[PDB]
């Protein structure tokens, strides 16, 4: 709730919107709007990393009490992170959910939006910080330390039969005067079975970043159509239930339509140009039905391709055979779908949905929205987001990271669109440059298993694959690629790694972790899994991202680290 706490929000603030994300911008531009509405000046921020965050707060060494960060938080007992915080108001709203408890407790400078059907970690603080063994926060028999310290009367207090609290059992000795430590460790470790179940085996994401924010601003009587679209963007990023889960899809078909359909501000007069209120339809995650012909865009998506195996010829043969049953002309299969004639381009999906039921594909259609600004053309559900990811354009000017962020947030207006087509173009060329490596690497047989996983390494830098989003995308097209056709049915289920050269950064051999096949809810080990070898030998590793599934190494200090990381 903040139908009460929002009424705190008038004084000065800082609105930080942590490292690059589509949840980020969609969730934050609305609040920029909200906050120049009630006549507040504030601060939006680019985040380059947790160090970027810490210097940022360092540069804002004031007493801005209404500090705000969003889509982060699980890093420390962040009073340890952020010492000078005294009673300063922070707000966490992150869906990176497996977060510390010291950030949850200490009801001082934090917002426990603790609301979940998992009441599983209640004494998770009641024994690690509250108990201790072989400790110094205590007294001694001598008269020089005759003062009572922060006596928790627990293992946090002494273990020499000095514990006024801890009134479950005997006092002097259970079997010995220090069986205190024995039972302390019993509970400690027997329930580190569940502490190590947290944060040291697996990570995930939770819920939205900004649909809660839509309901917040909905209670103040705003029917901002565009805010529905921006939140739609925020979700349709990791609506990708194979990437990171939505789940609620068939429940949000009630939720969001109920937000928007039932309140019909015009039921009879809406046949107008500007922003004719949003609609909903059941369509695909075929990449880019609209502005391209079929036959290139039927070819660069993984799911349409992997099930029909087109990077070899034979897939094209069966492809043509299904265009045959579809009876699309090849010319028409090479003019833009919109550039087609009428009747075919109307009936296209109408036929494809039902007579693809019978030929190896079942999971291409979705439920989404689309709308006009005017009479130019009818933009698409995600063709923003696949234009966005192409704006992470790590050029060597050193300004372009933050500048491309600022550009991106200045994109989803109804105004700036000469760039949006730019994003489309950039996206397409990268999208088929993805495919351009798979044939090279598959049929060169670069699929290094090397034991319990599959593994890739690469050799030099591409501007595609300088940054790691494209890298995860590489790994997540090859994987299906190889494991369709080179295997029996036994070994299709193992995880994957991939090197990522950075000729820019003096030689670091970046990596990204990614998971085996077809287990949507059973997600990453790699919330910590890499860190094993970090303990065993341990060499210059990083975990800088609030994204977990990533590292950054030296050019060449990986292989032995990998041999340790065999297990």
């Amino acid at each position: 709730l903040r139908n009460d706490f929002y009424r705190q929000l008038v004084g000065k603030r800082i609105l930080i919107v942590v490292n690059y994300d589509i949840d980020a911008i969609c969730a934050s531009r609305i609040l920029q709007a909200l906050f120049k509405y009630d006549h507040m000046l504030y601060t939006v921020v680019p985040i380059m990393g947790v160090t970027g965050l810490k210097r940022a707060y360092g540069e804002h060494q004031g007493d801005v009490k209404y500090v705000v960060l969003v889509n982060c938080g699980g890093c420390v007992d962040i009073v340890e992170l952020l010492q000078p915080s005294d009673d300063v108001t922070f707000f966490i709203c992150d869906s990176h959910r497996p977060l510390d408890v010291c950030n949850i407790y200490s009801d001082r400078q934090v917002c426990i939006l603790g609301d979940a059907s998992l009441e599983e970690n209640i004494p998770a603080f009641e024994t690690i910080f509250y108990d201790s063994e072989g400790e110094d926060e205590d007294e001694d028999e001598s008269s020089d330390t005759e003062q009572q310290h922060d006596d928790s009367g627990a293992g946090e207090s002494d273990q020499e039969d000095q514990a006024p609290r801890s009134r479950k059992l005997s006092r002097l000795e259970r079997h010995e005067q220090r069986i205190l430590k024995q039972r302390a460790r019993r509970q400690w470790e027997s329930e580190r079975d569940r502490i190590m179940f947290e944060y040291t085996q697996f990570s995930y994401y939770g819920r939205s970043a900004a649909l809660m924010v839509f309901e917040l601003a909905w209670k103040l009587s705003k029917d901002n159509m565009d805010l529905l679209w921006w939140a739609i963007v925020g979700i349709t990023e990791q609506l990708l239930l194979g990437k990171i889960e939505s789940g609620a899809y068939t429940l949000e078909l009630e939720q969001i339509q109920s937000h928007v359909s039932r309140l019909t501000n015009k039921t009879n007069d809406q046949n107008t140009m500007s922003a004719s209120k949003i609609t909903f339809e059941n369509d695909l995650h075929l990449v880019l039905y609209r502005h391209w012909p079929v036959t290139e865009s039927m070819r660069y998506s993984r799911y349409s391709s992997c099930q029909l195996k087109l990077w070899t010829l034979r897939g094209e043969k069966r492809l043509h055979e299904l265009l045959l049953e579809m009876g699309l002309p090849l010319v028409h299969a090479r003019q833009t779908y919109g550039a087609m004639d009428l009747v075919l381009r109307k009936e296209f999906f109408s036929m494809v949905e039902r007579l693809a039921e019978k030929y190896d594909i079942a999971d291409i259609v979705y439920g989404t929205f689309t709308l006009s600004y005017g009479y130019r053309s009818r933009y698409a559900a995600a063709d923003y987001v696949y234009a966005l990811l192409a704006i992470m354009e790590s050029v060597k000017k050193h300004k372009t990271p933050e500048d491309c962020f600022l550009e991106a947030s200045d994109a989803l207006s109804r105004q700036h669109k000469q760039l949006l087509s730019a994003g489309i173009d950039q996206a397409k060329l990268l999208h088929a440059a993805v495919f351009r490596q798979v044939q090279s690497s598959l049929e060169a047989r670069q699929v290094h298993s090397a034991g319990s996983f599959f593994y890739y390494v690469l050799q030099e830098e591409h501007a595609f694959f300088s940054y790691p989003y494209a890298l995860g995308l590489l790994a997540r097209f090859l994987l299906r690629g190889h494991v369709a056709t080179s295997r029996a049915r036994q070994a299709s289920d193992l995880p994957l790694i991939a090197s990522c050269p950075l000729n820019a950064s003096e030689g670091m051999c970046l990596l990204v972790g990614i998971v085996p096949v077809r287990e949507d809810s059973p997600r990453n080990f790699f919330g910590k899994a890499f860190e094993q070898a970090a303990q065993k030998s341990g060499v210059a590793l990083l975990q800088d991202f609030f994204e977990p599934a990533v590292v950054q190494l030296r050019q060449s200090d990986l292989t032995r680290f990998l041999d340790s990381l065999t297990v």
Partner: protein
């Protein structure tokens, strides 16, 4: 004039005639009226057009425009001169005489 379909009149009657008066976005640029008039001023006697505005307007003309363009693209001319000669009037007194024009695609 067999007013059932493919008629000489329906297009010119209002449709093409009003497409441009109707062609609108705020910023109040987004017509072909301004371009037309300011072209006329300098003896041009033409204007530039797209072919995917009909999708901005409708779903019928284009798959009829491709079929018998030879006629449609002169109905365009007639509609053009009648929709522009009203503006040739500053009042009825300075159309010394009308004139013929060429469309583009």
């Amino acid at each position: 004039n067999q007013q059932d379909a493919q008629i000489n009149l329906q297009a010119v009657k209002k449709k093409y005639k009003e497409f441009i008066r109707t062609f609108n976005e705020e910023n109040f640029f987004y017509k072909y009226r301004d371009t037309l008039k300011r072209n006329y001023l300098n003896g041009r006697y033409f204007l530039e057009i797209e072919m995917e505005d009909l999708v901005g307007f409708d779903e019928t003309l284009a798959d009829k425009l491709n079929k018998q363009p030879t006629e449609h693209l002169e109905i365009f001319e007639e509609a053009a001169r009648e929709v522009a000669d009203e503006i040739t009037a500053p009042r009825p007194e300075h159309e010394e005489h009308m004139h013929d024009i060429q469309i583009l695609l």
